[PDB]
Design an enzyme around this catalytic site. Sequence first.
Site, short mmCIF file in Angstrom:
data_model
loop_
_atom_site.label_atom_id
_atom_site.label_comp_id
_atom_site.label_asym_id
_atom_site.label_seq_id
_atom_site.Cartn_x
_atom_site.Cartn_y
_atom_site.Cartn_z
N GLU A 124 45.92 97.98 54.93
CA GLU A 124 45.03 98.17 53.79
C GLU A 124 44.33 99.52 53.83
O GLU A 124 43.80 99.96 52.81
CB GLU A 124 43.99 97.04 53.75
CG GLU A 124 44.58 95.70 53.32
CD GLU A 124 43.57 94.58 53.38
OE1 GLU A 124 43.96 93.41 53.17
OE2 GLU A 124 42.38 94.86 53.66
N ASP A 125 44.35 100.20 54.97
CA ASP A 125 43.79 101.53 55.09
C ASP A 125 44.66 102.55 54.36
O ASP A 125 45.87 102.57 54.55
CB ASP A 125 43.71 101.89 56.57
CG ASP A 125 43.23 103.29 56.79
OD1 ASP A 125 42.00 103.51 56.71
OD2 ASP A 125 44.08 104.17 57.03
#
Length: 143
Positions: A124-125
Amino acid sequence: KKWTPPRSPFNLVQETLFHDPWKLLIATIFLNRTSGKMAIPVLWKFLEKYPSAEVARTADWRDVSELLKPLGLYDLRAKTIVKFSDEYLTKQWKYPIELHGIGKYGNDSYRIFCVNEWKQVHPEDHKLNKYHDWLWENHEKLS
DNA sequence: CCAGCGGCAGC
DNA sequence: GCTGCGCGCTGG
Ligand code: NA
């Protein structure tokens, strides 16, 4: 056939730290809510004074906090770094999310760079996503 | 000059 | 679900 993650046009700091999972994970901690422009220069200063989990787990957290001052979250992360380094060395773990101070982002970093599990990771980064999408698009070319 | 914002634990 | 933690970079 050791896992060597390829260098990317994005030049994530994980790309140079993967040989030492502790150093890679410390880097993720330094990047918590901190721009890499600030964090990474200070990371080199930290690793010159605390080159290994073996010594970091014996550190006085108040000394670590002094070093971390310009990054913010200095008391929090000083205490985290000492405890993390202790668990890193003394707890049996398979994935570092098991360790204090490492969550999904540090764990995703480890599973892309330190072991050959990138195909199972769903980051998700944003930085990890750029590297990860690029791997998926280029893995057949890089074999 | 100035406000927003760049993971994780723990409750 | 939510909050505490914290500095400096950045856009304007
Ligand atoms: Na953890």
